[PDB]
Design a protein around this ligand. Sequence first.
Ligand code: CLA
Ligand code: CLA
Ligand code: CLA
Ligand SMILES: CC1=C(/C=C/C(C)=C/C=C/C(C)=C/C=C/C=C(C)/C=C/C=C(C)/C=C/C2=C(C)CCCC2(C)C)C(C)(C)CCC1
Ligand SMILES: CC1=C(/C=C/C(C)=C/C=C\C(C)=C/C=C/C=C(C)\C=C\C=C(C)\C=C\C2=C(C)CCCC2(C)C)C(C)(C)CCC1
Ligand SMILES: CC1=C(C/C=C(\C)CCC[C@H](C)CCC[C@H](C)CCCC(C)C)C(=O)c2ccccc2C1=O
Lengths: 732, 41, 107, 105, 222, 187
Amino acid sequence: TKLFPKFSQGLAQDPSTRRIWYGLATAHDFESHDGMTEENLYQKIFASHFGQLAIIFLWTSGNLFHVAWQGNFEQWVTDPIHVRPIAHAIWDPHFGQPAVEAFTRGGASGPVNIATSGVYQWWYTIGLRSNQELYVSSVFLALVSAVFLFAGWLHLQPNFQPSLSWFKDAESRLNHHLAGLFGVSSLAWTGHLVHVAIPESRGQHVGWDNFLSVLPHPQGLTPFWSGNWAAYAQNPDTASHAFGTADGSGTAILTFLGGFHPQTQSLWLSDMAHHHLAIAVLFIVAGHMYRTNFGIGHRLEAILEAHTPPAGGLGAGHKGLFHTVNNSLHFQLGLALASVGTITSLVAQHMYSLPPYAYLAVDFTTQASLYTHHQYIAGFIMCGAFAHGAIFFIRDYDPEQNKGNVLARVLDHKEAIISHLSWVSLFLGFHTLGLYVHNDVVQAFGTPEKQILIEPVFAQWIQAAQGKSLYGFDLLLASSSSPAYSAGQSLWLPGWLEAINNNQNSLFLTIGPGDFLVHHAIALGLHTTTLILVKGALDARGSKLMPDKKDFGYSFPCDGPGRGGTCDISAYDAFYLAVFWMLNTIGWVTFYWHWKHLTLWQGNVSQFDESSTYLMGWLRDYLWLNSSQLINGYNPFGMNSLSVWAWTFLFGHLVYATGFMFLISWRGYWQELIETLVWAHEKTPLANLVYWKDKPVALSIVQARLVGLAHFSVGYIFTYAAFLIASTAGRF
Amino acid sequence: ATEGYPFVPPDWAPALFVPLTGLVLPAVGMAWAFTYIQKER
Amino acid sequence: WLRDFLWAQSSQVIQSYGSALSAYGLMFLGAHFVWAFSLMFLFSGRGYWQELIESIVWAHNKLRVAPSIQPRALSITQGRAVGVAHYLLGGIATTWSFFLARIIAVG
Amino acid sequence: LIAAPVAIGGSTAALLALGRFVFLPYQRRRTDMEVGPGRLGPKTTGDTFFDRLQKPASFVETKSKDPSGFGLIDVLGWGALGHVFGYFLLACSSLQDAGIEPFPR
Amino acid sequence: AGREMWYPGATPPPHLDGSMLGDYGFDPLRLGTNPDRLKWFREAELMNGRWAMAAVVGILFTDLVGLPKWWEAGAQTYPIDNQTLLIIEIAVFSFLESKRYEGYKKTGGTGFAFFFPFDPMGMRSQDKELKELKNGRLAMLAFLGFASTAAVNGQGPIESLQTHLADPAHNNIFTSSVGKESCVFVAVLSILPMLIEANKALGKGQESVPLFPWNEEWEKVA
Amino acid sequence: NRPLWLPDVIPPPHLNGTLPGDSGFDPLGLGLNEERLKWYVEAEKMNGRWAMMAVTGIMGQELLGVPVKWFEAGAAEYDLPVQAQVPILFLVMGFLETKRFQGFRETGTSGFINSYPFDPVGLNSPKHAVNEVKNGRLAMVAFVGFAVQALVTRTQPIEGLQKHLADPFGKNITYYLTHTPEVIAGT
Ligand code: CLA
Ligand code: CLA
Ligand code: CLA
Ligand SMILES: CC1=C(/C=C/C(C)=C/C=C/C(C)=C/C=C/C=C(C)/C=C/C=C(C)/C=C/C2=C(C)CCCC2(C)C)C(C)(C)CCC1
Ligand SMILES: CC1=C(/C=C/C(C)=C/C=C\C(C)=C/C=C/C=C(C)\C=C\C=C(C)\C=C\C2=C(C)CCCC2(C)C)C(C)(C)CCC1
Ligand SMILES: CC1=C(C/C=C(\C)CCC[C@H](C)CCC[C@H](C)CCCC(C)C)C(=O)c2ccccc2C1=O
């Protein structure tokens, strides 16, 4: 009997090496821990959330500290278009003399690493200019990380541990978080913007010593108490304005010009100032909605039980759903992860087209890395959302609690939903692959005019509805006689139209038949991932092959070779197979983004337009042409700065290959091999004296799927990140 | 210094700190974890 | 090895379109497809596919197009055999197309 | 531009008069079918300090001395509505007299 | 751990019951939790403190008589080469420390050479040990201060004392280059007893032992 | 039975009236826990006492004609630099507060050092306690007023008082909230 799995007494009784792996894997599965109630579980989750907050704040404090220490933030401030950002210095004793000489980029002395995280543009936009301010930010963020540490320890002692009902208070939690965590937080952010970033972009240094002596607007809060709010939007920054000086600038703190800055190719500071102010006001207003100790407010259970449509449209409607969401933590986790992943996808799709940071659009590799990072994060988070929804369905779903409601009715015709998802996925894949293979074999025969080029009329029609006059559709917001163009004609239309009719920026790029085909491939990937995740969630508790899946836990290997074979029958394996489809889908979207933007930056958009139709052109002009500088990182002739990216490329290849090692072969042959190794160690001289305390045992089937998926994913991420940053940094 | 009071680390700090967390801290981690796992009640 | 063998060569396979060796590029990409399609049969199991087949059987049962022979997922040994066969076919045809296009367009 | 004192005062007087003489009978009917005698009722049940926070306040049920049920919290809410509407009207006037037309032409 | 404590109102560590002298409850990280470890750490503390006492009194003597600076004294000219001086130093210490360790094994006392305990005068009393421990720890801190004022000030203890007496408002540590570092450090040290008190107040009945790699106090945690 | 809070009936469940300066002011219910109640009593007395000494220092400094203002007192040439207080400023008050906490663990009242009644002159009456609490609350309101004078009016407290006496209609909240903020910055 060991004591490493203190949460699981049964795991401590395991005499094999499986105990270590299972204790590490079931580290934060508090619902399966031995002798644990609901209230202690909620308190443990509260402390864990405090721990993740402290970790996040410590990590960003370290980012500030390393940028202020070894970066070139002052040199970047003086020249953003020329000087490259620096993340951290490189001190590797295994480096050679050419290796040190090949990493002193950005006008530095020692070996440094070029920063593509975007923090330089972000901190230059929000008024941070010197490394002193970054140092102060780092020490303050470390201080608040320590504060969150102490608070997480604070809510674990007696007379301070919150009760179970305190966590289940839904209306007051939503009221407080929507009012303060969103509303007054955005109000503080737009106050910081107006006080610091707006004058710092106009050559007026605002710091802690003089922000009480300087004034943000020359009228000085008289518009705010009075009604004359248009005095703030009176003298905005002109087109010939520099983000560092006050050359041709104006005195405006809140304005809605729209579009982009003509110099920095980014959204106006007053635009985001009024944006965050309006968001703050709307969220504070919306935060006064749910019912609290006072007599006014809204009750969530009342709204859920009241919204039951007549004539049995949704059966019982949302009746009995408040207790289902409140009692099940996995339901709330799945909803939160779904919204977080969807909004991370939204952030990725809105950052590149509407850059909010000065000189971010000029930094091509930084934008590519940011988009790829947040898209892969969003995909993983959506996969986790569906997995935790499946966990809700099997673990803490009570059908008699909500009988005839939307949840039970959805579970009733789950076969119809799964079958229709399978139909749309099969149809999309069939015809997308058919047209891709058709166009590719047509281009092979020397006759590229025979390929099927279906023009994306719908999205071009939408773009023309937004003011893009390239396609010639004289719809609303593109014609002067439409009411939508006239409404806002003097507010933000001359900025938005100028920004959307310029093809140099990334705002609403022109799209051809190859764009539409890869969009359909993206839809295919989304549909198939949704199909498998939905099928795993709905069949998590029951199936015709196995009606009692809810009794076997969420993550169990199989049921055996009987009944034909039940391999990968759990919803955990459904998630595990869905991660491959998620990786493929985000790979498709990032391939599309990277190739279209690379052809835009190089200037040959026609190459992408005529080459993205067929898959051979995709391969040759994306995975082969752009990989020339990547694999030349360390030639036998010599080494350059891209040697780290080529090594990371081959590293990701090797880790993906080891993922294949864990994925193809299954446990049962490895057990006999380990048994032969056990006999070898036990029956040899000079080594039988040294004996294991944990019995060597091959990796479990669920563990095998986890480690194969893990190796596959990290190898995938590393090789694609290496290729992306090497192809975007080799030329620009 | 001109407001170096948010203390700037020395220019020789990597030579001490990189091997400290690359060689010593992993060693303490392995030793502590191996004492943890092989602990009988 | 990578850069000077699989990237220094195979430049004629991708540029074989419009020429006599375009079928080698078609064979190359189809072999990529078949090699990649095999990993479905290799990573996955039978229970998930059996449940998906059950959903499809329900769909065909709703409008009475149920086959008399009950649709079943491939056996675990059958699935492994299909996966290894498609993997070998894809890899062999990939190397075949690359080798033949490189040695004909140059040698 | 509209005078801000008279605009804010008129808007908040109109909103308070509406909330007392007009929508107060319509109010508390939603609470009879929301937290009423046979409805969900109490938010929490336990008797620890973290549960008394969810319990209703002590100054919201004291039978406010107005002839109707118009309490302090209702006064604050309807005055907030009046201030919101007055600031909305003042903001529209500020956009109007600056020479900028937000309406479609 | 003695009624007088490292900060007033502190609680003694469970292993620091106060049986050994010089106890003040000062064990934040709890380095020594074994009685053999505790007595070895006491012997090592007495060794380092005795060498600190000898070094510090030599420093004051050399600064009083006018001899040049100690950290630059290693480069000064001296009779006998430093190679054979070092060799005979190890040659005599491989016997002296051997006798010290063997006497500590057989008796535990801090004797010298063949004399264990080396007390020819005979003022062997517990109060003498307590006074020796206090003066030793003070000399430990004094040598650390001497090294610091040799590093940043570049002057001896006598020159540092004269600069403190000349203008104590500005010729202190807190106005030097290591000034605000020391200010933050002493502010953290002032906050430190209150966080310990807060841990004791919230942890009314819990062990709250500091679990660390240098001690096995975490075995009772799990 | 109590003089109570606001117009009239607002019955507090956890505030019976035995507490010094008890009027039932708990519209949101933060002090239900008894240990938290006594801790918040002591902490209210602490912020009140510090508010007392803060505001009295402010008007004493202004009345005795010191040149520097109370909000600009940090950056001026004094005999001991700012780097020289914060060692012993933190040290002596950490000692004092640690002693008072290790005494409050068993006494439950305030106290300077050891002598926890802290009454060289005595006169410890409940009327004195109610006076202390209520004049302390007045001191918190006064210090908040002083801080907002320093922020908005950017002038000394008694100077602002004399401005209110000299021009009562012309130095009100409307003038100092609308007419001033473009003028006070470099007045
Ligand atoms: C003019 C008459 C009218 C109309 C048109 C509606 C219309 C509606 N009411 Mg209704 N209502 C009316 C009068 C009317 N109301 C009156 C007079 C009252 C009394 C005051 C109500 C009270 C009432 C309540 C209390 C509720 C509604 C709700 C609804 C909505 C859902 C209705 C329903 O049963 O779901 C449609 C029927 C179904 C069986 C749903 C099937 C959905 C399928 C399975 C999903 C398909 C997914 C598909 C794959 C998506 C593909 C997208 C692609 C991009 C991938 C719908 C918008 C509900 C609501 O708010 O929901 C929005 C609700 O709770 N109504
Ligand atoms: C790049 C390789 C690849 C390809 C092409 C596919 C293709 C497919 N998988 Mg996927 N899959 C893969 C790798 C791949 N997988 C990997 C590595 C994993 C991780 C284990 C998965 C995991 C996975 C799961 C978990 C699921 C799928 C599903 C699907 C189907 C999605 C439906 C669709 O898009 O329309 C069809 C797409 C096509 C590409 C059609 C291929 C058929 C063409 C037309 C050729 C047909 C034969 C041709 C006429 C020649 C005849 C002769 C020849 C047979 C000898 C489709 C058959 C889903 C499914 O089957 O449910 C609907 C599903 O649930 N796959
Ligand atoms: C903030 C969101 C969130 C939250 C609160 C949780 C919380 C939980 N989930 Mg969920 N989950 C999430 C996100 C989240 N997860 C995401 C994003 C995914 C998709 C990847 C999943 C997928 C998922 C599954 C499939 C399961 C859970 C389970 C669990 C439980 C325990 C998991 C745990 O800590 O094991 C601790 C696990 C480890 C310490 C292993 C770490 C190894 C990681 C995952 C691999 C990383 C690859 C590589 C090694 C990284 C290093 C690279 C190297 C180069 C340095 C717990 C209820 C399990 C559960 O409920 O039990 C039945 C379960 O079955 N979740
Ligand atoms: C499994 C499960 C789960 C999960 C789930 C999920 C994960 C989901 C997701 C989902 C999603 C992820 C969704 C999404 C959605 C979206 C939407 C619905 C959208 C909409 C939009 C709109 C409506 C728009 C509009 C507009 C505007 C506003 C502007 C422009 C124009 C237009 C008109 C377009 C749970 C937890 C529940 C539990 C149970 C089971
Ligand atoms: C007793 C009596 C009376 C009187 C009454 C009164 C006097 C009342 C009160 C009061 C009023 C008369 C009013 C109130 C109000 C309240 C509130 C509570 C408000 C609020 C507000 C707000 C919340 C705002 C907001 C905002 C801001 C802050 C800024 C920007 C804009 C906005 C709007 C967003 C009479 C004679 C009739 C009759 C007899 C009896
Ligand atoms: C996909 C998959 C299935 C499902 C696959 C099945 C049931 C076999 C399907 C065979 C089809 C029906 C053969 C015919 C294909 C086309 C209909 C041919 C078209 C020809 C044109 C001319 C129309 C498994 O059963 C399985 C089992 C064990 C491990 C992995 C897997 C696995 O990955």
